[PDB]
Amino acid sequence: KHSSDICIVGAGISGLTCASHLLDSPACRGLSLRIFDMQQEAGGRIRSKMLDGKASIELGAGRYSPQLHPHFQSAMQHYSQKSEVYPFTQLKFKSHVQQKLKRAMNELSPRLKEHGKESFLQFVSRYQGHDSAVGMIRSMGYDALFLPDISAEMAYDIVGKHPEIQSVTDNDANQWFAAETGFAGLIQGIKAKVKAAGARFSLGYRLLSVRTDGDGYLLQLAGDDGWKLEHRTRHLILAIPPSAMAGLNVDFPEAWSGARYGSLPLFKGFLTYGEPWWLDYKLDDQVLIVDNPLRKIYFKGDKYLFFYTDSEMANYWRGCVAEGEDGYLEQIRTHLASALGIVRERIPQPLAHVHKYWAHGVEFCRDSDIDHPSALSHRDSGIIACSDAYTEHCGWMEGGLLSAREASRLLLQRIAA
């Protein structure tokens, strides 16, 4: 009827890579593959848009590194997606604290054996006081570094893996790339190749409950026009992040692993101008990291600028945008002036602008060394979970590519046995 052998819920890069693997193995010749996604287009947190029509921007995932993301780089190669160089790898304008930051971290490196499981701010508060730790951490631009569930070990890692601040650790030799046409180009390639292998896509449907009926599973979905729908399937991968797994009858996270999980919100806003005015200030391809709310300001060539924030500072912008769009634009203009040491009259007004708020932008495992495998399995019901958070690269596309490969392994095992 309305049934399938294998069903993947989730059409981000995790899901579509689980689809890509299964299709090639001849363990799946003549088997039926259905992919469901709650949105109307695949990608998940990869989301490329044409702004004004003149340029290509990344509302979600933006950059990758061949050092840290070789499986992603191989993917971009395999689908003939052309990469470009990502300029935002040094701060031209290192302030006094950003100066001190570099040395100030090679030196507490030892004490991470002793107290490295403290919070990152608890940790640094011992070098100088609370008030110097904050100035140091603020100066790095990523507010998540102030959370309590961010260990001081997790923190030395995060800054080593971000292009704008990597120079502060011994990860300063990592190259970074973005997509020419945008990562959605990769997503389309995988989609198209999975489609021609005969997987069937039902985009715009959202899973609500799962129950076992004997040899298989029985899914309750609700389309986005209200249409309820049910689907009998023999094998199921839930290619969706932990935050999404919480909202079902699958007893998550208890039936799946020992871990608890968390997430942070992220906010990006982009602005386009008539004239590229930041060229006078020699600013194309530069990143300021500031103490004001924009926190990280980027000038892409002569094309546009954008900023990028997280945690409390992402909620703050999602609040401001809710209070109407003209006060949001006027706060941006104010803070662009502070970062450039000028007065707001010399900042034009924009033509166009877009913004994106991700409630659960990065999801991450809260327990280090609890022995976390790439994909999870429901101990009772035998469902496979698959997400970047279940990996060493929580919060990276690479973590999706690796959870998917494991997740497609444990599936095939369930078939051939």
162 is in an annotated binding site: yes
Which of 62, 241, 269, 399: binder of ligand FT6 (CB under 6 A)? 62
Per CB under 6 A, does 310 bind ligand FT6?
A: yes
Other C-beta atoms lying within 10 Å of the C-beta of residue 101: 21
Q: Does 61 bind ligand FAD (CB under 6 A)?
A: yes
- Interaction residues for a copy of itself, span 299-318 (CB under 8 A): 318
C-alpha distances (whole Å) from 312 to each of 110, 142, 271, 359 are 31, 10, 22, 11
CA distance 164 to 307: 13
- Which single residue is written with the structure tokens 């309305």? 2
- In angstroms, rounded to a whole number, what is the distance separating the alpha carbons of residues 120 and 132? 13
With CB cut-offs between 5 and 8 Å by kind, which of a copy of itself, Mg ion, ligand FT6, none does residue 239 bind?
Mg ion
Listed ranges 14-22, 73-81, 210-218, 322-330: which one lies at the site for a copy of itself (CB under 8 A): 322-330
Smallest gap from Cβ 63 to ligand FT6, in A, equals 6
Residue 288 Cβ, how far from Mg ion at the closest point, in Å?
A: 33
Residues 52, 193: contact at Cβ < 8 Å?
no
- Site stretch for ligand FAD (CB under 6 A), options 54-62, 149-157, 184-192, 321-329: 54-62
Which of 85, 279, 322, 351 touches a copy of itself by CB under 8 A?
322
Q: Is 210 helix (H, G, I), strand (E, B) or coil?
A: strand
- 105 counts as binding ligand FT6 under rule CB under 6 A: no
Residue 310 binds which entry of ligand FAD, ligand FT6, a copy of itself, none, CB below 5-8 Å type-dependent: ligand FT6
What are the backbone dihedrals phi and psi of residue 22, each rounded to the nearest 5 degrees, phi first?
Answer: -55, -40
93 vs 89: CA distance, rounded Å:
12
15 binds, among Mg ion, ligand FT6, a copy of itself, none (CB under 5 to 8 A by kind): Mg ion
Distance from the first to the final alpha carbon of the chain? 26
Q: Of the ranges 200-208, 238-246, 259-267, 339-347, which one interacts with Mg ion (CB under 5 A)? A: 238-246
Q: Which of residues 194-223 bind ligand FAD (CB under 6 A)?
A: 206-207
Determine if 137 is a binding residue for ligand FT6 (CB under 6 A).
Answer: no
Number of residues that bind ligand FAD (CB under 6 A): 37
* Residue 144 binds to ligand FT6 (criterion: CB under 6 A): yes
* Spatial distance between the Cα atoms of 277 and 333, rounded to a whole number of angstroms: 13
Instruction: Decide: 257 and 367 in contact? Cβ < 8 Å.
Output: no
Q: Collect all residues with Cβ–Cβ distance below 8 Å to 394 and sequence separation of at least 6.
A: 362, 363, 364, 365, 388
Those residues whose C-beta lies under 8 Å from the C-beta of residue 388, and which sit 6 or more positions away, are 14, 241, 363, 394, 395, 396, 397, 398, 399, 400, 403
Smallest distance, Å, CB 162 to ligand FAD? 9
Tell whether 63 is in a known binding site. Answer: yes
Q: How many helices (H) and strands (E) does the chain have?
A: 12, 17
- Hey, what are 121's tokens? 């701010």
User: What is the C-alpha radius of gyration for the chain, rounded to an integer number of angstroms?
Assistant: 23
**Which of 51, 147, 187, 239 touches Mg ion (CB under 5 A)?**
239
Helix (H, G, I), strand (E, B) or coil at 321: helix
* Contact mark string toward a copy of itself, 215..234, x via CB under 8 A: --------x-xxx-x-----
The identity of residue 242, as a single letter, is: P
SS3 assignment, position 367:
coil
Which of 361, 364, 391, 406 binds ligand FAD (CB under 6 A)? It is: 361
64-83 positions binding ligand FAD, by CB under 6 A: 64
Residue owning tokens 């961010």: 150
- 170, burial (CB in 10 Å: exposed 0-12, middle 13-18, buried 19+): exposed
Nearest to 50 by CA among 233, 230, 304: 304
> Residue from 359, 367, 370, 413 that binds a copy of itself (CB under 8 A)?
359
Listed ranges 9-17, 59-67, 189-197, 390-398: which one lies at the site for Mg ion (CB under 5 A) = 9-17
Footprint on this chain of a copy of itself (rule: CB under 8 A): 1-2, 200, 202, 205, 223, 225-227, 229, 318-319, 322-324, 356-360
Residues that bind ligand FT6 in the complex, under the rule CB under 6 A: 62, 142, 144, 158, 162, 264, 310, 362, 395-396
